[PDB]
Amino acid sequence: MKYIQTEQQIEVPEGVTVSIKSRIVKVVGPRGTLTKNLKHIDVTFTKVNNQLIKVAVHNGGRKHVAALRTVKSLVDNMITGVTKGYKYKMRYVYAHFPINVNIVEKDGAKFIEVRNFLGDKKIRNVPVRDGVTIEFSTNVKDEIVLSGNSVEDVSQNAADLQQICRVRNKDIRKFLDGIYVSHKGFITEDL
Amino acid sequence: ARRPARCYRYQKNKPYPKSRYNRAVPDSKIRIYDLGKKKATVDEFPLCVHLVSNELEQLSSEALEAARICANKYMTTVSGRDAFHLRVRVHPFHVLRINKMQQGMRGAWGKPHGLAARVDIGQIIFSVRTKDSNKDVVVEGLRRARYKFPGQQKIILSKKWGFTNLDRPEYLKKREAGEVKDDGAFVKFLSKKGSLENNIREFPEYFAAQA
Amino acid sequence: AICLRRLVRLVDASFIWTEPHSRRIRIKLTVTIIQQTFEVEYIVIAMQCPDCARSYTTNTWRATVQIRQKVPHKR
Amino acid sequence: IIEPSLKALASKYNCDKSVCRKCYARLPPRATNCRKRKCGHTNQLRPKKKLK
RNA sequence: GCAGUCAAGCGUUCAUAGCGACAUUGCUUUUUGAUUCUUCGAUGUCGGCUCUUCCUAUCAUACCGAAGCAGAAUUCGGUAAGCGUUGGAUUGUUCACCCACUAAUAGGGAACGUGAGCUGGGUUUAGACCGUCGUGAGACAGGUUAGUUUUACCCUACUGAU
Ligand SMILES: [Mg+2]
Ligand SMILES: [Mg+2]
Ligand SMILES: [Mg+2]
Ligand SMILES: [Mg+2]
Ligand SMILES: [Mg+2]
Ligand SMILES: [Mg+2]
Ligand SMILES: [Mg+2]
Ligand SMILES: [Mg+2]
Ligand SMILES: [Mg+2]
Ligand SMILES: [Mg+2]
Ligand SMILES: [Mg+2]
C-alpha cells in the first residue's frame, strides 16, 4: 500500500563511534574498525543524541521496508563485532580414518590443510580470510576455533571448511564423516 | 471405444433423444442418482449444499459416474454413510453420434456412441442435504467431484431448508402450527382452497388454536 | 512364448505373481550335473496391432459380396 | 565411533531435512514451500527418509 | 506419438522411493486417415552408397538431487546437444530379426535431405512361363524370368586464384 514513513532504532553502546557519509558506515571500537557500503539500499540515517541512531524509509513499499530492518541488523553486528567479537567452534566426526588438519604457509597467504579425509590422497586446502584468526582447541579433542571482528568472514571461513569435506558416491545418512560447526558465539564473556 | 471428452464438449447439434426413429442406443453409465440415507425425514437434514455449473456445456454419462463415486466415497469414510442424502439432479438423455466406418464422405451418417447431459449456466448438478455441524465434509466431498468434470463449477451453501422450496425461518413459521405434514421423502403443506371435508381428514393439528 | 524368447535345455518353467496393471512379468527357470534356478523379468510395452488401427480408417472390411434379386417376393 | 552428540551434530546437516516432491530438492525441516522457481514454489513437500 | 492432473490396485506395517488402471486438460506433425488449394504445353516417382548441417523429446560422456542408496551393482529426476553412437549373417527392402565388439550401439528434421552425384536389386511399357478366373479377346495391386538412366560452356552460390 506504500507506508507514509517507517523507522527503526539502532542503539549504540558507550564505547564505539559510528561514522556515516553517503552510505559508507564506519564503526571504530575497541577490537578494531569495520566499514560497509550501503549505497545499494536507499535509506536515511539520522542521529538524535550519540547513543541512539534512527534509520528511516519514506513512502516505502513492502519490500523496501523489509530491507530497512536488515540494514539495522548489519549495522548492529559491526557494533557487537568491534566490541565483543565473533567466535565459531567446529568439531571433526569420524569412525575409521582420523582427519588431520594443519595451518600451512604458501606465498604468505595461510591455508587450512585437511589431510586424510575418509582415506583420500587429495590434499584439501582452504585459504584463511583477512582478519579471521584460526586456532586448534587444546583439551577438547578434534575441535577447532575461528575468531575475529566480522561475522561475514568467520562464518564463511567456517562454511568453506564445512563444504570442503563432502562425501561423493556414498550414503551420507551412513557416512557421516566431516568437520561441522558446533557452536557460534562471541569472543568476550558476560554479553 | 471411447473418444476424448474434448470432442463432444459443446452443445452444437439438436436434442437427439431415444425414440422410434433412433431406436438403438447404448445403456447409460450412471444408473442410480440418489445416495446416502434416502429414507430420511425432512426435519433430520436441514443444511443444503449444491454443486452449480458455471458453463453451458455437455457432461458425459461417465463424467458423472466417476464424480458420483468419489463424492460418496469421501463422505462415507469421514462422516459416516448415514449422515447425508446426495442427489444427482442431471439425467443423461442426449445421444452422441460417431462416424465409425464406398469412399470417405460418399455416404456419411454416424452410428450412436453414448449418452450425455446438456448443462446450463447456474444449473444444479449435485444436491446434498445434511446436519448443521456436518458442513466441512460436504464442501470437501464435492471438491473432488469437481476435478472429474470439465469447465467451471462452484459450490454454494443454500438458504433454503433441505430440499424444500422454503427458507430457514419461513419453514419454522409454518411447521410450528399444523400447516405442514410429512409426505414420505418430501413434504405436504396446507391449502386454503379445495374441499373443506378432506382438508380436515388430513392435517389434524390445524383447526384448534391451543397446541 | 516368453521362455521361447529368452536369447542348457531346462528342467522346469513356472512364473511368479506381478500385479494386474504393473507393466511387468517375472518368471523362473530351472536348468549335465549342476541344477540352477534363476529368475528373469520382462518389461511389457504397449502399441497398436494394425487391424485395430484399420478400424479407425473407414475402409475396414476389405472385401464385399453384394447379393441381389429383382423380385418383390423372394422365395 | 558414532558418538551420541557427534551423530546428532552431523545428522543436523545431512538427515534432518525435507524434500520437494516435484523437483527432489533438499529443504529445511519446517518449510512450507520449495525455494526453487522451476517447480512453482510448490507446497507438496515430504520429510527425508531415515536410515533403518 | 509425447506430457501433465486425480490416484484404483501394488509396493510384508505403510497412497505419493518406485510400478502404476481408468478418467479429466494439452502439445506434436517422425504414423495413418479426411479434404482437393497449387502442378496434367511433365517439379524424375523405393531403397542403398556418399556428405554437410540443424532439433532435443539425452543412449553414452561432465557436475549434481532423490531412493524401500551399508558396499558393489542399480532405479528415478535436474543443468547440458560440447563430444560420440560401430563390424557382420538373411531380405531389393524401409521395417524386422539374429551374431559380435563397445564408453554408447538414443530418437528425429532439412521438397518423406540428396538420380545434369552414382547405382538400378525393387516398382511401372513392349518378349516369355505357371496358377486361378473368363466361351473368347483377355484380367490378376498373385508367383517367376529378360529388359536404352541424355545435356553445363550461362547467372548465382561454394572453393581456390589475379
Ligand atoms: Mg484442385
Ligand atoms: Mg513449363
Ligand atoms: Mg528439379
Ligand atoms: Mg534440454
Ligand atoms: Mg554390408
Ligand atoms: Mg525424397
Ligand atoms: Mg540434385
Ligand atoms: Mg539420372
Ligand atoms: Mg513385360
Ligand atoms: Mg478354361
Ligand atoms: Mg530389373
Swiss-Prot record, chain A:
A Gene Ontology biological process in which this protein takes part is: cytoplasmic translation
Name the InterPro entries for this protein: Ribosomal_uL6-like, Ribosomal_uL6-like_a/b-dom_sf, Ribosomal_uL6_a/b-dom, Ribosomal_uL6_CS2
Where is the major localization of this protein? cytoplasm
Question: Which of UniProt's keywords are assigned here?
Answer: Cytoplasm, Ribonucleoprotein, Ribosomal protein
A Pfam match is Ribosomal_L6
UniProt-recorded Gene Ontology molecular function terms? rRNA binding; structural constituent of ribosome
Q: Kindly provide the name given to this protein in its UniProt entry.
A: Large ribosomal subunit protein uL6A
Q: Which organism is it from?
A: Saccharomyces cerevisiae (strain ATCC 204508 / S288c)
Could you read off the lineage of the organism from its UniProt record? Eukaryota, Fungi, Dikarya, Ascomycota, Saccharomycotina
Q: Which gene encodes it?
A: RPL9A
Curated annotation (Swiss-Prot), chain B:
Identify the main location.
cytoplasm
Q: Which Gene3D superfamilies match?
A: 3.30.60.300, Ribosomal protein L10e/L16 (3.90.1170.10)
Q: What GO cellular component term, any one, is given? A: cytosol
What InterPro entries does the annotation carry? Ribosomal_uL16, Ribosomal_uL16_CS_euk_arc, Ribosomal_uL16_dom, Ribosomal_uL16_euk_arch, Ribosomal_uL16_sf
Q: Per its record, what are the GO molecular function terms?
A: structural constituent of ribosome
Q: Which domain of life is it from?
A: Eukaryota
Keyword annotations of the record: Cytoplasm, Isopeptide bond, Phosphoprotein, Repeat, Ribonucleoprotein, Ribosomal protein, Ubl conjugation
Asked if Repeat is a keyword of the record, the answer is yes
**Where does each sequence repeat begin and end?**
157-171, 190-206
Q: How does it assemble?
A: Component of the large ribosomal subunit (LSU). Mature yeast ribosomes consist of a small (40S) and a large (60S) subunit. The 40S small subunit contains 1 molecule of ribosomal RNA (18S rRNA) and 33 different proteins (encoded by 57 genes). The large 60S subunit contains 3 rRNA molecules (25S, 5.8S and 5S rRNA) and 46 different proteins (encoded by 81 genes).
* Role this protein plays: Component of the ribosome, a large ribonucleoprotein complex responsible for the synthesis of proteins in the cell. The small ribosomal subunit (SSU) binds messenger RNAs (mRNAs) and translates the encoded message by selecting cognate aminoacyl-transfer RNA (tRNA) molecules. The large subunit (LSU) contains the ribosomal catalytic site termed the peptidyl transferase center (PTC), which catalyzes the formation of peptide bonds, thereby polymerizing the amino acids delivered by tRNAs into a polypeptide chain.
UniProtKB/Swiss-Prot annotation, chain C:
This protein's superkingdom?
Eukaryota
Location(s), subcellular: Cytoplasm; Nucleus, Nucleoplasm
Q: Which family does it belong to?
A: Belongs to the NMD3 family.
Q: What else is known?
A: Present with 11900 molecules/cell in log phase SD medium.
Q: What does this protein do?
A: Acts as an adapter for the XPO1/CRM1-mediated export of the 60S ribosomal subunit. Unlikely to play a significant role in nonsense-mediated mRNA decay (NMD).
Quaternary structure note: Associates with the 60S ribosomal subunit.
Protein name from the UniProt record: 60S ribosomal export protein NMD3
The record lists the organism as Saccharomyces cerevisiae (strain ATCC 204508 / S288c)
Q: What is this protein's gene name?
A: NMD3
**Could you say which residues of the full protein are shown?**
83 to 169 of 518
Curated annotation (Swiss-Prot), chain D:
Which regions span the lipid bilayer? none
Cross-link entry Glycyl lysine isopeptide (Lys-Gly) (interchain with G-Cter in ubiquitin), positions: K17
Q: What is the annotated signal peptide range for this record?
A: none
The protein's superkingdom reads Eukaryota
The entry's localization annotation reads: Cytoplasm
Assembly: Component of the large ribosomal subunit (LSU). Mature yeast ribosomes consist of a small (40S) and a large (60S) subunit. The 40S small subunit contains 1 molecule of ribosomal RNA (18S rRNA) and 33 different proteins (encoded by 57 genes). The large 60S subunit contains 3 rRNA molecules (25S, 5.8S and 5S rRNA) and 46 different proteins (encoded by 81 genes).
| Function recorded in the entry | Component of the ribosome, a large ribonucleoprotein complex responsible for the synthesis of proteins in the cell. The small ribosomal subunit (SSU) binds messenger RNAs (mRNAs) and translates the encoded message by selecting cognate aminoacyl-transfer RNA (tRNA) molecules. The large subunit (LSU) contains the ribosomal catalytic site termed the peptidyl transferase center (PTC), which catalyzes the formation of peptide bonds, thereby polymerizing the amino acids delivered by tRNAs into a polypeptide chain.
Name this polypeptide is given: Large ribosomal subunit protein eL40A
Please report the organism this UniProt entry assigns to the protein. Answer: Saccharomyces cerevisiae (strain ATCC 204508 / S288c) (Baker's yeast)
Q: What is the lineage of its organism?
A: Eukaryota, Fungi, Dikarya, Ascomycota, Saccharomycotina
Task: Describe which stretch of the whole protein the shown chain covers, with first residue, last residue and complete length.
Answer: 77 to 128 of 128
